[PDB]
Design a protein around this ligand. Structure first.
Ligand SMILES: *[C@@H]1O[C@H](CO)[C@@H](O[C@@H]2O[C@H](CO)[C@@H](O)[C@H](O)[C@H]2NC(C)=O)[C@H](O)[C@H]1NC(C)=O
Ligand SMILES: *[C@@H]1O[C@H](CO)[C@@H](O[C@@H]2O[C@H](CO)[C@@H](O)[C@H](O)[C@H]2NC(C)=O)[C@H](O)[C@H]1NC(C)=O
Ligand SMILES: *[C@@H]1O[C@H](CO)[C@@H](O)[C@H](O)[C@H]1NC(C)=O
Ligand SMILES: *[C@@H]1O[C@H](CO)[C@@H](O)[C@H](O)[C@H]1NC(C)=O
Ligand SMILES: *[C@@H]1O[C@H](CO)[C@@H](O)[C@H](O)[C@H]1NC(C)=O
Ligand SMILES: *[C@@H]1O[C@H](CO)[C@@H](O)[C@H](O)[C@H]1NC(C)=O
Ligand SMILES: [Zn+2]
Lengths: 596, 195
């Protein structure tokens, strides 16, 4: 008759009543994202509202089970995630306006359109209009126009909404016993009550800045390398000692330097891999891409996909009978139901993300035996980290020639390895300073260390210093440039992409360590090694039951995020960048500007 | 020349829920047990005291045919020395069980779009079930210490909860029709033998 045993019975009724209500939530949400209709929209809203209304029902009843008298940790965790007040401790009127802000900020982002003053007939949205200009054009002014006009015409609309978004999110945060809304997001990493694996919210910021200091030598030589390469493509605009202009970075915000590969390829006269065309000649389709991905996981001792996965999941575009959200997703609907919604084409990018998305299901299927409230990754960065390591092992020529997609007589030498690692660094290493600086800006804005009348000045102060990227047009406080990104204006934490990067290379190093791998770490392919899949499965089946500090050690052997495995993955490129910058200037000055 | 009516048990129109599992004793007849195993249509055919090795060549005084519907991962609990919601609160087999456990997937009949909720089970009970005991009570389960007075509420829950049988459910959550044959021997006329 303890509070603990009364909670175990309360959680029993919850786990059994939530299973069907959550199933009706996503089973109706599936028929919208595949058969988009205002009828299926309300069916998705009605089923989603009753599920969220059920979560509010049980939470207030879960509040009557104080955790002070409870000592079982798994019972503590399920109640904590359930006792979460969240958006409900607010008033009943500013909770509506807060959601009205979130819905309007998302609407302006997804509906924003700009047109050029030289031919206003056609008008371009972000996708696919403006994104293609920022990822394919070498015209300085065409990139400058699409860059500025996006933040000048939709970002300025979000500045007043974001200013009201910060105060309402902070009122809800401190009403939930937090310092700020940033401290509310950092709670995903907090662990209490486990001595030897405890980890508080403030410890994340110290560790993020600590590991980032050990990446700067690699990032500076990568920054200085592409800066000299960009000077050849933009001679009258780049300066060899200043920061990189923001509109010449591969996309609209410079989140990834991937599209700069054609401008910065070290050995562009060496053959690219790009198995895309080889898939079209071999009559490949959507099913063979996923069927080949299934054989990758069963080779390391993981189970095969459920029969309902092939029956229910949509693997290609509907075919002019429906319209869908072709953004790749992995679905855990409960009741043992697992799906993947992704309109695949015959492309190497889709062949790798298929292994990435199927890696989510293997994680989802592993913690299915766990209780409902513990069916999730260890932290926010775990799910996306285990997805990247599946594409890492599948993209190497060690695996491409294995499945008979690359001609065996491929000139695999030290020059092709630099090209592959340079392509990897533009996407992986290039996003770390962008991610940390962006999240810390929101971290200091939520706490209050950045006043409202200096939001954009301190935004570009850290862009020039931390990222090494300078704006091409001076922006006053009427601009809201961070909100011009999806994750900022759609209420999403962004530091998850930083820890995901470091987690994925601690995982890959430990898996290949037990996978009998000889040679550089970047040429590894964990398939056919069931010993590596078992060491990974020992963490996936845990889910949210045990702390991420302990769950991380079950694979890697360290209780905290480590940056050393990331640096050793790119060291063959690191030393190559050191000699290629012997007569270059590594670093950047903050006072330079393309507008002077 | 009377064959035991096993078709009335297996091929029955509707099945009972495991909390109110239906027992039907079979006596004074002829049983061709090997017909059941020579079918290859059953998901689970495990015998524990008898052997499916064509041992219809023996007699028993009375054999009982218990049938119910549970989930896929819950037929594991239909075995001697098992625990769980089905084994503890719904249907319990003895540690010295002598018989066979037969089951097969029935998502084609007992599952429909929108959810089939006709079958239900018992989630809470003050004590475990002794072998072959059945409870069809609806009294409110007092989890706390305040008198529930026959009402649901805080630490006072209704004991019977519904199964959700959707056609898109996983194999572990799909409805499975189970039939348990328990052979009993006493100092009795040994009714059913079967050639
Ligand atoms: C916290 O409670 C859980 C739930 O009872 C304990 O775990 C279980 O152990 C029993 C055996 O005693 C098994 O029958 C259950 O299947 C287990 N369930 C789960 C969810 O693990 C757990 O040991 C308790 N923790 C502590 C520290 O006492
Ligand atoms: C969630 O919010 C409720 C209030 O909505 C918090 O509870 C109050 O609890 C104290 C006792 O500590 C009472 O004196 C108040 O009267 C309660 N308020 C209301 C409105 O009933 C609760 O502590 C919050 N829980 C968490 C985890 O944040
Ligand atoms: C899409 O939904 C409508 C009703 O909302 C239905 O009539 C139609 O058959 C569905 N389309 C497909 C391809 O299932
Ligand atoms: C799926 O796994 C089972 C394991 O029992 C195996 O027998 C079967 O051959 C596998 N099928 C495929 C297509 O991988
Ligand atoms: C795995 O082993 C099978 C045969 O056992 C072989 O056909 C396949 O190419 C191997 N794959 C890798 C990546 O070694
Ligand atoms: C049930 O009916 C099928 C045909 O519908 C038959 O083959 C089978 O033998 C029957 N089972 C019993 C136990 O009579
Ligand atoms: Zn993913």
């Amino acid at each position: 008759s303890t509070i603990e045993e009364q909670a175990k019975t309360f959680l029993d009724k919850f786990n059994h009543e939530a299973e069907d209500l959550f199933y009706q939530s996503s089973l109706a949400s599936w028929n919208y994202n595949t058969n988009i209709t205002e009828e299926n929209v309300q069916n998705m809203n009605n089923a989603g509202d009753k599920w969220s209304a059920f979560l509010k029902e049980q939470s207030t009843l879960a509040q009557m089970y104080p955790l002070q008298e409870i000592q079982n940790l798994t019972v503590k965790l399920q109640l904590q995630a359930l006792q979460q007040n969240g958006s409900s401790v607010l008033s009943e009127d500013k909770s509506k306006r807060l959601n009205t802000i979130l819905n309007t900020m998302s609407t302006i982002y997804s509906t924003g359109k700009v047109c050029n003053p030289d031919n206003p007939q056609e008008c371009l949205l972000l996708e696919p209009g403006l994104n293609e200009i920022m990822a394919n054009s070498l015209d300085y002014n065409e990139r400058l126009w699409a860059w500025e006009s996006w933040r000048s015409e939709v970002g300025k609309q979000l500045r007043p909404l974001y200013e009201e978004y910060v105060v309402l999110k902070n009122e809800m945060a401190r009403a939930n016993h937090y310092e700020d809304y940033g401290d509310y997001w950092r709670g995903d990493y907090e662990v209490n009550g486990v001595d030897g694996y405890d980890y508080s919210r403030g410890q994340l910021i110290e560790d993020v800045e600590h590991t980032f200091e050990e990446i700067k030598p690699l990032y500076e030589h990568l920054h200085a390398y592409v800066r000299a390469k960009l000077m050849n493509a933009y001679p009258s605009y780049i300066s060899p000692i200043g920061c990189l202009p923001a509109h010449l970075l591969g996309d609209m915000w410079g989140r990834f330097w991937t599209n700069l590969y054609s401008l910065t390829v070290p050995f562009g006269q060496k053959p690219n891999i790009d198995v895309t065309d080889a898939m079209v000649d071999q009559a490949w389709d959507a099913q063979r891409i996923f069927k080949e991905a299934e054989k990758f996981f069963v080779s390391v001792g993981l189970p095969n996909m459920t029969q309902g996965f092939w029956e229910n999941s949509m693997l290609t575009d509907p075919g002019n009978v429906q319209k869908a959200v072709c953004h790749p997703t992995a679905w855990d609907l409960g009741k043992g139901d697992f799906r993947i919604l992704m309109c695949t084409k015959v492309t190497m990018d889709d062949f790798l993300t298929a292994h990435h998305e199927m890696g989510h299901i293997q994680y989802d299927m592993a913690y299915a035996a766990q209780p409902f409230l513990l069916r999730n990754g260890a932290n926010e960065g775990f799910h996306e980290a285990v997805g990247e390591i599946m594409s890492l092992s599948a993209a190497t020529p060690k695996h491409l020639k294995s499945i008979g997609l690359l001609s065996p007589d491929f000139q695999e030498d030290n020059e092709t390895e630099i090209n592959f690692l340079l392509k990897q660094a533009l996407t992986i290493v290039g996003t770390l300073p962008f991610t940390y600086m962006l999240e810390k800006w929101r971290w200091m804005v939520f706490k209050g260390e950045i006043p409202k009348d200096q939001w954009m000045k301190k935004w570009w102060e850290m862009k020039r210093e931390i990222v090494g990227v300078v704006e091409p047009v001076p922006h006053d406080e009427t601009y809201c440039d961070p909100a011009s990104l999806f994750h900022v204006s759609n209420d999403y934490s962004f530091i998850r992409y930083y820890t995901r990067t470091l987690y994925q290379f601690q995982f890959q190093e430990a898996l290949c360590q037990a996978a009998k791998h000889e040679g550089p770490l970047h040429k590894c392919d964990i398939s056919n090694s069931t010993e590596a899949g078992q060491k990974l499965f020992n963490m996936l089946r845990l889910g949210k039951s045990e702390p991420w500090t302990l769950a991380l050690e079950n694979v890697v052997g360290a209780k905290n995020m480590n940056v050393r495995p990331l640096l050793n993955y790119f060291e063959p490129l690191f030393t190559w960048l050191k000699d290629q910058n012997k007569n270059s200037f590594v670093g950047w000055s903050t006072d330079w500007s393309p507008y002077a | 020349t009377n064959l035991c009516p096993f078709g009335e048990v297996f091929n029955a129109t509707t099945f009972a829920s495991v909390y109110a599992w239906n027992r039907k004793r079979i006596s004074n007849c002829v049983a061709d047990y090997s017909v059941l195993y020579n079918s290859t249509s059953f998901s689970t055919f495990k015998c524990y005291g008898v052997s499916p090795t064509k041992l219809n060549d023996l007699c028993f005084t009375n054999v009982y045919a218990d049938s119910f519907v549970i989930t896929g991962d819950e037929v594991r609990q239909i075995a001697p020395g098992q625990t769980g919601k089905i084994a503890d609160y719904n249907y319990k087999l003895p540690d010295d069980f002598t018989g066979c456990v037969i089951a097969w997937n029935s998502k084609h009949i007992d599952a429909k779009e929108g959810g089939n909720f006709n079958y239900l089970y018992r989630l809470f009970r003050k004590a475990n079930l002794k072998p072959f005991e059945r409870d069809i009570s609806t009294e409110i389960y007092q989890a706390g210490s305040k008198p529930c007075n026959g009402q649901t509420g805080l630490n006072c829950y209704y004991p019977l909860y519904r199964y959700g049988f959707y056609p898109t459910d996983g194999v572990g959550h799909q409805p499975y029709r189970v039939v348990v044959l328990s052979f009993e021997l006493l100092n009795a006329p040994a009714t059913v033998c079967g050639p």
